[PDB]
Ligand binder design. Sequence first.
Ligand SMILES: C[C@@H]1C[C@H](C)CN(C(=O)c2cc(Br)ccc2NC(=O)CCC(=O)O)C1
Ligand code: NI
Length: 558
Amino acid sequence: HHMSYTWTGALITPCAAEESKLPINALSNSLLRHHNMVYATTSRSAGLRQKKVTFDRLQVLDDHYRDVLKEMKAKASTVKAKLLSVEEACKLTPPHSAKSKFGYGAKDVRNLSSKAVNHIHSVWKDLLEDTVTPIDTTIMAKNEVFCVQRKPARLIVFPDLGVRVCEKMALYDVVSTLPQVVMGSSYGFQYSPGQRVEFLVNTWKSKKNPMGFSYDTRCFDSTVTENDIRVEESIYQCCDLAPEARQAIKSLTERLYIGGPLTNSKGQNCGYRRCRASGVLTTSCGNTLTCYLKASAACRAAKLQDCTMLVNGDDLVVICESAGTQEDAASLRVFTEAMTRYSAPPGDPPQPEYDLELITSCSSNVSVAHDASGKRVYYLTRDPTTPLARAAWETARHTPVNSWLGNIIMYAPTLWARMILMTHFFSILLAQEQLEKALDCQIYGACYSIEPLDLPQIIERLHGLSAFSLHSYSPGEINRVASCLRKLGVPPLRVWRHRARSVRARLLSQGGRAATCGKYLFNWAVKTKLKLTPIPAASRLDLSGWFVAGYSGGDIYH
Ligand SMILES: C[C@@H]1C[C@H](C)CN(C(=O)c2cc(Br)ccc2NC(=O)CCC(=O)O)C1
Ligand code: NI
């Protein structure tokens, strides 16, 4: 058997006390009344996830697969990648990333303390000298917030801190550089949300009769086989690399990436992994390469015409030429059969779509609004259910990752981000005078320390000034927002408009950066608008590294 996991029977254990029910404070009801709709996942449901992720994988590899791989390797050979120093690798480590089993923490790593740096050096030497001994990993249940309809906790699998820094030294430059070179415009993590909409729309516009579909692989990490993971290393090895980097990548593949022993928080042996570790540097890059490889081959197998893929890890969308409605449904059944043969069967079956705004990829869809001139403007949005469940949790609880800040960055142009999220959280931050306190959030899986007072500069830079003037959202978009609010017990959009006028007035009264936030962020709320001009600070905003690559699970801080 080629099983994704084997289990001893030891439980997946928490390392802290876990909350499942929505924490409520005095601010909760101003956002959300249906508190019972909102939950966090815990280790109590881990067993249910273990049944989902444990299965036998079969893989039949044909000539389309090897043809695509050979083309990918040829592009990969043009990549020259650098070895990071220990010091460079250390500054990429999140301030609150899990501490070592070996007497030092993430703060120690970032300060380049001699004890951390000495141990990292010893893990590095061990990797160069030993290419066989499985590396230990911890298995944990993630605590994640959702609206009902309950999901079981996702699992996270990660090596010790010293190993994680070693992954960066060996491979940070590779996973940041290689996928765009190999996949070109198909690599999703190179785009901002607006660069993504322009690619999707331009691609849709370059087909006589466009057809698109998203493809949902059931448990993508568990579908990743030893072959798949060895193929990724052969792709990494195509790069021009230093001899120490080649040996470290070989060693990390053999000892960590291919599989290893699973240990709970209590130190007990839980089992063994033979699939993708969800918490290593190469998770995002490995997943994107494996998904693009299999999908590219599956496109050729199905005889899909003029195929453009967009791939973000395990998230896949294809836009192609329609050969007619019946040949489309048929070609999708063959694409799906090919994918299955390659060990990537679907969860939901793929559906062909003939309207761009109806395809969901990366939990997002294109939509249309109008700028300050009446022009039709395409922008990225999503169903706000999960953004709003998480915002409710963050209303009453301090969390490591402020999802609301990251959702405002990613979805600033949206009706729901501007009306609810900006209104709610600027109002909370005004009341606490915490406007200039930097908060952690994540974009494409990497962690960023961000001042909420810098939001005007940031939004202009990523989305343009039009994000501050959009209006006349589509009916379907308005109805999905309004309907989500009713479900969660959120006050309707008229209440938020009334609240934003208050919040705006309050911000301008602070002067300076707060006034800029009031001026730019809430101009949609007043009838007598202000003159919104390019912000000098935005020009100078150092936004390098932001949408280059994906590092979900990769333990990255910028
Ligand atoms: C769909 C919302 C319903 C709410 C009651 C009012 N309303 C807004 O205040 C609004 C919010 C943002 Br953010 C941007 C524009 C808004 N107003 C409009 O789109 C009004 C119609 C228009 O200008 O075409 C729109
Ligand atoms: Ni061939």
